[PDB]
Amino acid sequence: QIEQPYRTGYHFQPPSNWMNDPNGPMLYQGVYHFFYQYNPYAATFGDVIIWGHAVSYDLVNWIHLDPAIYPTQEADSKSCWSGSATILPGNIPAMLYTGSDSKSRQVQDLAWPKNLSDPFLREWVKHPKNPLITPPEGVKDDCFRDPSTAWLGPDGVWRIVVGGDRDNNGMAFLYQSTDFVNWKRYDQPLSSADATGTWECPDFYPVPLNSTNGLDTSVYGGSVRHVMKAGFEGHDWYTIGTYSPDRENFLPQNGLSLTGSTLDLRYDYGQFYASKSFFDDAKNRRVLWAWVPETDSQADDIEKGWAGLQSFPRALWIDRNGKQLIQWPVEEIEELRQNQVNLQNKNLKPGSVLEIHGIAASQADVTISFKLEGLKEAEVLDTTLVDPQALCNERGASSRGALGPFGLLAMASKDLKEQSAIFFRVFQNQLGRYSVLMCSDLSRSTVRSNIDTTSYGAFVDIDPRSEEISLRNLIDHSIIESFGAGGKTCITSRIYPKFVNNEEAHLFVFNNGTQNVKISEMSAWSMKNAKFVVDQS
């Protein structure tokens, strides 16, 4: 028997209880600070939510501290919800968050560390004038929240966006300030979308064109584009565009308004929400954090005593083509790699299954690259309007095609009674153009009941003719993070196989298509546990 077989070995999560939205991430005085929505009283959401707090020197190993922000004034007496961190000139980290006041309305509050001598910034003080911002005119009291990190314009004026909606229309309310204390709502929103519901945890930042690095939130220029990210209808969406501080205008590169359709982009196409990013000026990279909800039942959560994970922090940058964002786990994770098992120039005949031996199958980093032969044999299927998720749910690992399904079988039992299949399929339209589909088939991930086993999928923007299809998988017990084509397509999965309570997990490479595929190269590393020290009470 294993105790708590679903807890991760190297993903961030509190000692126990409920955790959701990541909060105020930042790098200050050489220390990485991480905060998060936390319920100290249960493994479910509750009436009292506070900011958990942990620190790290590498974004991998953490030290749990006491909660940093918790109700202490009328402006946040009922709860301290999501917010962001902004380090102001003079080296002072300023935290803006949404509080639930005594009248139960969402208002924006300010707080900053009370002792900058403390490397861990344990104590925080709140501004006497909170709330600093209250719901605009035609906005309901429970539809105005999640202030972003601020950016300083050339005119020396700070800008931030706050989520919410006006008549069910998603909003990124724009506010300005020079002292960071007195904010004035700009006439028009920075951006918005019809009938999307409340825009949660908006994030607005710049990315450098033709560069795989990150930028400080206040950078601007012709060689820079901006990303407008917002969570709604259950997912985190984003759009790349141009920002004009002068007239506070954001113009979508594709001229579209978010609709939450297959027309829009997402960071991750699986369980990924309330994502928030921060700039790391030490490594010159933008790091992204995201809450990964549980997909088991509430009863299961209460029973196992905890709920909620954070995705592994990943570097974020814009693709060479400037049409989408790329994600990749921060290099520090590589230090967890132990022994390695490799494979090269290996053919996977139709309907075959190859087991990877000598790896801790429940906690590993697996990378594989496929070399395809005879693309012309690809099934004909125009995918212009096709919904990749629907397609993956319709055709799992048991649905045999020409090119596909071929990929990985993670968190699988010896008998394969339970398995999580991350694979690819290749199609072509009538004109002979190819398209690639990436799937996370969770249909057979567990034999347990009351487990959301919905599958996730997305199309990968690569040309199968000139580049091999690559796939990286972060396997960590109840979570699997899949990165297709170097990070062009990301899918996070939560799985709860039953076998984990008795026998060990297994790892496999498979090809259930009728066509042959080859593994040019495959690398698998056992990942040692990340350290989590508690320094509370």
Ligand SMILES: *[C@H]1O[C@H](CO)[C@@H](O[C@@H]2O[C@H](CO)[C@@H](O[C@H]3O[C@H](CO)[C@@H](O)[C@H](O)[C@@H]3O)[C@H](O)[C@H]2NC(C)=O)[C@H](O)[C@H]1NC(C)=O
């Ligand atoms: C991909 O290759 C096979 C394509 O179908 C798939 O087979 C699965 O296992 C057997 C093999 O024919 C069949 O199972 C059927 O019968 C059992 C009887 O107990 C049912 O429980 C199943 O639901 C199903 O009706 C099916 O053909 C198929 N069934 C499933 C989903 O297990 C392989 O499993 C696939 N290989 C991989 C690695 O996924």
Ligand SMILES: *[C@@H]1O[C@H](CO)[C@@H](O[C@@H]2O[C@H](CO)[C@@H](O)[C@H](O)[C@H]2NC(C)=O)[C@H](O)[C@H]1NC(C)=O
């Ligand atoms: C502000 O932070 C500093 C640094 O953490 C605190 O100083 C430490 O205090 C502990 C307990 O009193 C000592 O064991 C350490 O040796 C101190 N180190 C330093 C840097 O002097 C300081 O106490 C904090 N201020 C308050 C009011 O708590």
Ligand SMILES: OC[C@H]1O[C@](O)(CO)[C@@H](O)[C@@H]1O
């Ligand atoms: O915990 C409450 C917080 O969580 C969210 O609903 C998103 O998951 C935020 O919009 C809010 O600030």
